Amino acid sequence: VIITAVYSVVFVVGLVGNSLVMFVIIRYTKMKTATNIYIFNLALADALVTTTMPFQSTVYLMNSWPFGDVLCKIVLSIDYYNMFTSIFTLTMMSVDRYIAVCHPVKALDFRTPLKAKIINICIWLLSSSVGISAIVLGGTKVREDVDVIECSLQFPDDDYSWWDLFMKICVFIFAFVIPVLIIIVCYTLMILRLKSVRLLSGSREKDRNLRRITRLVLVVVAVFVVCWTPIHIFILVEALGAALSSYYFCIALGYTNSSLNPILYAFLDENFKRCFRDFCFPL
Amino acid sequence: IITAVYSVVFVVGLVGNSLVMFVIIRYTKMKTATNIYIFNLALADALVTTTMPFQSTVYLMNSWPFGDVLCKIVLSIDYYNMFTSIFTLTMMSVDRYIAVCHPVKALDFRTPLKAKIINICIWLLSSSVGISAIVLGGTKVREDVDVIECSLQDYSWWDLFMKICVFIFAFVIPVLIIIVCYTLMILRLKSVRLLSGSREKDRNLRRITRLVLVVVAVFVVCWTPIHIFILVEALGALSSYYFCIALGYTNSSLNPILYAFLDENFKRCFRDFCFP
Amino acid sequence: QVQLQESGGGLVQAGESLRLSCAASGTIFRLYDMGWYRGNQRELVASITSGGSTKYGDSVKGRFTISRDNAKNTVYLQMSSLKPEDTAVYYCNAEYRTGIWEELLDGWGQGTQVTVSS
Amino acid sequence: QVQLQESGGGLVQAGESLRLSCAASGTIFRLYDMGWYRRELVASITSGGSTKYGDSVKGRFTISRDNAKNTVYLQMSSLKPEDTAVYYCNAEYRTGIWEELLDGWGQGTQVTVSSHH
Ligand SMILES: CC(C)[C@@H](CN1CC[C@@](C)(c2cccc(O)c2)[C@@H](C)C1)NC(=O)[C@H]1Cc2ccc(O)cc2CN1
Ligand SMILES: CC(C)[C@@H](CN1CC[C@@](C)(c2cccc(O)c2)[C@@H](C)C1)NC(=O)[C@H]1Cc2ccc(O)cc2CN1
Ligand SMILES: CC(C)CCC[C@@H](C)[C@H]1CC[C@H]2[C@@H]3CC=C4C[C@@H](O)CC[C@]4(C)[C@H]3CC[C@]12C
Incomplete structure (x- = not known):
C-alpha cells in the first residue's frame, strides 16, 4: 500500500548515507585510515547502485524497460561496476x-x-x-514471446547459451566464491591470533583499535554475504534450469545492503560516530 | 516526475516530531515550560503528518478512494492541527x-x-x-464529473462565512498577539543589560526567545499562502494550491530540525540518542 | 570577536602622571561597564558606566580621573601624583554583548605594567 | 567486572616467611598476566609461566600459578624489615575477544616485618 515510500526511504539513505561517508573521509583529515579509504570505495559503489533504485522500481511496475539505450547502457554498467568494486573492496579490507x-x-x-x-x-x-x-554491449531488445522491451548485455547469437552459462559461472565463482573464501581464510587466521595474543601492537590503544576495526569489517562482511547470497544462487539456478517473485526479493536484500552500510560505520566505529555527531550537530 | 521528496518529508516529520516528543518525556533534564508547548506542537505536527499518503492518493486519482469514516477522521485531524499549532505558537510567545x-x-x-x-x-x-469537522465533513460525488469529494457539508454562504471566521480567529488575531509580544520583548532585550539577575538566565531567556521567533516566523511564511488562497477561492491556479499544501507539510517536519539548530539542549539529546 | 587595546603605562618617576586608555574594538552590540583593576591582583581602581557613574578605589580617589567616550568605545584613566605604592599591573575590563540574543560577557585585556620609581 | 581475592599478609617477625594468593574471579574471556605490586613491581607471571621479579627481591620470593583455578601464589621467604609495604595484586583480563586489554587491581594485603628473631 505504502511500499511506494519505504522504497524511497531506503533510496534516500543509501544516496545520502554513502555521500556523507564519502564527504567525511575526504574533508576531515583525522579520517584517512587505511581502512577508511576502502570504505570510501565501498560507499562510492553503494552510492552508484542506489542511483539505479528508481529505474529498477519503474521496471517492477511497468514490467518492460521504458528508458533509452543510453540509459540501459549506463545502468547495466553502473551495475557491473558495483558488483565487482564492492566485493573486491571487502576482500581487500579483510x-x-x-x-x-x-x-x-x-x-x-x-x-x-x-x-x-x-x-x-x-x-x-x-x-x-x-x-x-557493459557500456559497449549494453542495449535494448524487444522480447520475442513477450512484446516487452528488455535491457541486457548483447552477445553474439551464435553460441549465446554457452557464453551466457560460462559468464554466469565465472561471475558466481570469481566474484562471489573466491572472494568469500579469501575472507574466511583471512578471518580464521585472525581470530586464532586474537584468542591467544596478549598485545598485537606496542600500545594498548593500537591493540584496542586493531581488534575494534577488525570487528567492524567482520560485521560489514557479514551483512554483505547475507544480502548477496540469495541473488547469486538465483542467477545460477535459473541458468542451469515462472511467476517467480524471488528475483525482486533477492534484489530487495541487495539494495538494503547498499543502504545499510552507511549506518553500520556510524554504529561500529567510535570515530565515524564522533565525526557525524560533530558535523550534523556542532555543539 | 520525481516524487520521493514527498515521501522524504513524510518520514522526517513523523520520526522527528516523535523523537522531539520522546526526548521531553524520558529525560527529566528538559521538562521546561517552553518544552511542554513544543511537545504539544510536535504532537500536532506528528498527527497531521499521518495524512500525507491520503493527500498524495487524492493527488494522483483526483478523487477520494477512502471511505466517509476516513474522510471525517482526516477532516478532524486536519482542524485539530490547524488550531493547536497556531494556539500553541501564540501561547509560547x-x-x-x-x-x-x-x-x-x-x-x-x-x-x-x-x-x-x-x-x-x-x-x-x-x-x-x-x-x-466530523459533523460537517463527509463524502459526496461531484455533480458532473464522476469523482468522490471529501469536504465540509447547507448554504454556500456559510462556507464563506466559516472560512472568514477561521481566518480571523485562527490566523489574524493570533499573529497580532505575537507581533505585539515580540515588539515589547525586543525593546527590553535591547534596553536591559542582565535580564534575570543571573548571567545564565539572561543567556537562556534570550537564546530561547530567538528559537520561538524563528519557529513562529517560519510558520507564518508556510501558512500565509494557503490561508489567503482558501479565502480568494471563496470568491468564486490548481498548481498553486498544492504548492500551498506542500508549504504546510514542510513546516510540520521542519520544526524538529529547527529545535536542533536553535536549542543546544535539543541539539544535545539528538546526539546522545542517535550517536551514543 | 572583540579585542581590548591598551596604552599608556610604563616606568616613570614618582609624583609624575600617566594616562591609560582602553578601546573596545570589534563587534560590540552594547557596552555596559568599563574599568581598571590593578596577593590576588584583581582589585578595583576605577570603573565607569555608559551613563557616567564612576567609582574609584579607596587609595586612588583624589589623584586618578576616569572618563569615557561612548562614541569611541574607549575609556581613559588620568593618573596623577603617582607613588611607588601604585606599582602593579593594571588590567582593563569591559562588559559587552555581541548581539541582541547573545549572552553577557566580561572581557579582560592583556595588562599594562606601571612601575613608579622611589 | 573482575573480583580478586587476596590472603596471607600481616605482622611477622624478620627472617620469617609468608605466602600470598590472589584469585581472579568474574566474567572474563582470557587472563594474561597476574602479579604482585607494591607502586613498584615485586613479582609477575604470564599465562605461560614465565616469571619476572623486582630487583629488591634477590631470589627470596617465588611466584607460581594455577591457570586451572585462576589463582597466583607468592611464596615470600627470608623476610627483611625493609619489605614492609602494601602488596597489591594485579590481574590482566579481557572481557571479550574483540575488546580492550585492561587490568584490575586488588584491595591489597598488608605485610609488616619488625625487630629480629
Ligand atoms: C543491487 C544489485 C544487486 C543490482 C543492481 N542492478 C539491479 C538490476 C539492474 C542491473 C537492471 C538493469 C537493467 C534492467 C533491469 O531490469 C535491471 C539495475 C536495476 C541495477 N545488480 C544485480 O543484481 C547484479 C546481480 C548479478 C548476479 C549474478 C550475475 O551473474 C550478474 C549479476 C548482475 N546484476
Ligand atoms: C497541513 C495542512 C496545510 C493541511 C492538512 N491536509 C489538508 C488536506 C486534507 C484535509 C484533505 C482531506 C480530505 C481530502 C483532501 O483532498 C484533502 C488532509 C490531507 C490534511 N490543512 C489544510 O490545508 C487546511 C487549510 C485551511 C485553511 C483555511 C481554512 O478555513 C480551512 C483549512 C483546512 N484545511
Ligand atoms: C486566539 C486565542 C489564542 C486567544 C487567547 C486570548 C487570551 C487567552 C490571551 C490573548 C492575549 C493574552 C495576554 C497577552 C499579554 C498579557 C499581559 C501580561 O502582563 C500578562 C499576560 C497577558 C494578559 C496574556 C494572557 C493570555 C491572553 C489574555
Missing part, C-alpha cells in the same frame, strides 16, 4: 585487516593511506574490464 | 513575554505543570472545532 593483525611488523610499511588508494584505483580498473564492456 | 518582561511574576507563573494545564486547555478548544 586482507588489509589480516596483514594488520597477523603481520604487525611488516604492516609498519605495508599499510598506508596512499597504498590503499592505489589498491582502490587498481580495483576500478579491474572492474572496468567488465564495466566499460 | 505570551509565555516568552512573561518570561523576559515580567521576571518577578514568572517565578510563580512559569511552572511546567502550569504549561500542561494551558496545553490541555488548548486541545479542548481545538478538538471542539475538530469535532465539528
Whole structure:
C-alpha cells in the first residue's frame, strides 16, 4: 500500500548515507585510515547502485524497460561496476585487516593511506574490464514471446547459451566464491591470533583499535554475504534450469545492503560516530 | 516526475516530531515550560503528518478512494492541527513575554505543570472545532464529473462565512498577539543589560526567545499562502494550491530540525540518542 | 570577536602622571561597564558606566580621573601624583554583548605594567 | 567486572616467611598476566609461566600459578624489615575477544616485618 515510500526511504539513505561517508573521509583529515579509504570505495559503489533504485522500481511496475539505450547502457554498467568494486573492496579490507593483525611488523610499511588508494584505483580498473564492456554491449531488445522491451548485455547469437552459462559461472565463482573464501581464510587466521595474543601492537590503544576495526569489517562482511547470497544462487539456478517473485526479493536484500552500510560505520566505529555527531550537530 | 521528496518529508516529520516528543518525556533534564508547548506542537505536527499518503492518493486519482469514516477522521485531524499549532505558537510567545518582561511574576507563573494545564486547555478548544469537522465533513460525488469529494457539508454562504471566521480567529488575531509580544520583548532585550539577575538566565531567556521567533516566523511564511488562497477561492491556479499544501507539510517536519539548530539542549539529546 | 587595546603605562618617576586608555574594538552590540583593576591582583581602581557613574578605589580617589567616550568605545584613566605604592599591573575590563540574543560577557585585556620609581 | 581475592599478609617477625594468593574471579574471556605490586613491581607471571621479579627481591620470593583455578601464589621467604609495604595484586583480563586489554587491581594485603628473631 505504502511500499511506494519505504522504497524511497531506503533510496534516500543509501544516496545520502554513502555521500556523507564519502564527504567525511575526504574533508576531515583525522579520517584517512587505511581502512577508511576502502570504505570510501565501498560507499562510492553503494552510492552508484542506489542511483539505479528508481529505474529498477519503474521496471517492477511497468514490467518492460521504458528508458533509452543510453540509459540501459549506463545502468547495466553502473551495475557491473558495483558488483565487482564492492566485493573486491571487502576482500581487500579483510586482507588489509589480516596483514594488520597477523603481520604487525611488516604492516609498519605495508599499510598506508596512499597504498590503499592505489589498491582502490587498481580495483576500478579491474572492474572496468567488465564495466566499460557493459557500456559497449549494453542495449535494448524487444522480447520475442513477450512484446516487452528488455535491457541486457548483447552477445553474439551464435553460441549465446554457452557464453551466457560460462559468464554466469565465472561471475558466481570469481566474484562471489573466491572472494568469500579469501575472507574466511583471512578471518580464521585472525581470530586464532586474537584468542591467544596478549598485545598485537606496542600500545594498548593500537591493540584496542586493531581488534575494534577488525570487528567492524567482520560485521560489514557479514551483512554483505547475507544480502548477496540469495541473488547469486538465483542467477545460477535459473541458468542451469515462472511467476517467480524471488528475483525482486533477492534484489530487495541487495539494495538494503547498499543502504545499510552507511549506518553500520556510524554504529561500529567510535570515530565515524564522533565525526557525524560533530558535523550534523556542532555543539 | 520525481516524487520521493514527498515521501522524504513524510518520514522526517513523523520520526522527528516523535523523537522531539520522546526526548521531553524520558529525560527529566528538559521538562521546561517552553518544552511542554513544543511537545504539544510536535504532537500536532506528528498527527497531521499521518495524512500525507491520503493527500498524495487524492493527488494522483483526483478523487477520494477512502471511505466517509476516513474522510471525517482526516477532516478532524486536519482542524485539530490547524488550531493547536497556531494556539500553541501564540501561547509560547505570551509565555516568552512573561518570561523576559515580567521576571518577578514568572517565578510563580512559569511552572511546567502550569504549561500542561494551558496545553490541555488548548486541545479542548481545538478538538471542539475538530469535532465539528466530523459533523460537517463527509463524502459526496461531484455533480458532473464522476469523482468522490471529501469536504465540509447547507448554504454556500456559510462556507464563506466559516472560512472568514477561521481566518480571523485562527490566523489574524493570533499573529497580532505575537507581533505585539515580540515588539515589547525586543525593546527590553535591547534596553536591559542582565535580564534575570543571573548571567545564565539572561543567556537562556534570550537564546530561547530567538528559537520561538524563528519557529513562529517560519510558520507564518508556510501558512500565509494557503490561508489567503482558501479565502480568494471563496470568491468564486490548481498548481498553486498544492504548492500551498506542500508549504504546510514542510513546516510540520521542519520544526524538529529547527529545535536542533536553535536549542543546544535539543541539539544535545539528538546526539546522545542517535550517536551514543 | 572583540579585542581590548591598551596604552599608556610604563616606568616613570614618582609624583609624575600617566594616562591609560582602553578601546573596545570589534563587534560590540552594547557596552555596559568599563574599568581598571590593578596577593590576588584583581582589585578595583576605577570603573565607569555608559551613563557616567564612576567609582574609584579607596587609595586612588583624589589623584586618578576616569572618563569615557561612548562614541569611541574607549575609556581613559588620568593618573596623577603617582607613588611607588601604585606599582602593579593594571588590567582593563569591559562588559559587552555581541548581539541582541547573545549572552553577557566580561572581557579582560592583556595588562599594562606601571612601575613608579622611589 | 573482575573480583580478586587476596590472603596471607600481616605482622611477622624478620627472617620469617609468608605466602600470598590472589584469585581472579568474574566474567572474563582470557587472563594474561597476574602479579604482585607494591607502586613498584615485586613479582609477575604470564599465562605461560614465565616469571619476572623486582630487583629488591634477590631470589627470596617465588611466584607460581594455577591457570586451572585462576589463582597466583607468592611464596615470600627470608623476610627483611625493609619489605614492609602494601602488596597489591594485579590481574590482566579481557572481557571479550574483540575488546580492550585492561587490568584490575586488588584491595591489597598488608605485610609488616619488625625487630629480629
Ligand atoms: C543491487 C544489485 C544487486 C543490482 C543492481 N542492478 C539491479 C538490476 C539492474 C542491473 C537492471 C538493469 C537493467 C534492467 C533491469 O531490469 C535491471 C539495475 C536495476 C541495477 N545488480 C544485480 O543484481 C547484479 C546481480 C548479478 C548476479 C549474478 C550475475 O551473474 C550478474 C549479476 C548482475 N546484476
Ligand atoms: C497541513 C495542512 C496545510 C493541511 C492538512 N491536509 C489538508 C488536506 C486534507 C484535509 C484533505 C482531506 C480530505 C481530502 C483532501 O483532498 C484533502 C488532509 C490531507 C490534511 N490543512 C489544510 O490545508 C487546511 C487549510 C485551511 C485553511 C483555511 C481554512 O478555513 C480551512 C483549512 C483546512 N484545511
Ligand atoms: C486566539 C486565542 C489564542 C486567544 C487567547 C486570548 C487570551 C487567552 C490571551 C490573548 C492575549 C493574552 C495576554 C497577552 C499579554 C498579557 C499581559 C501580561 O502582563 C500578562 C499576560 C497577558 C494578559 C496574556 C494572557 C493570555 C491572553 C489574555
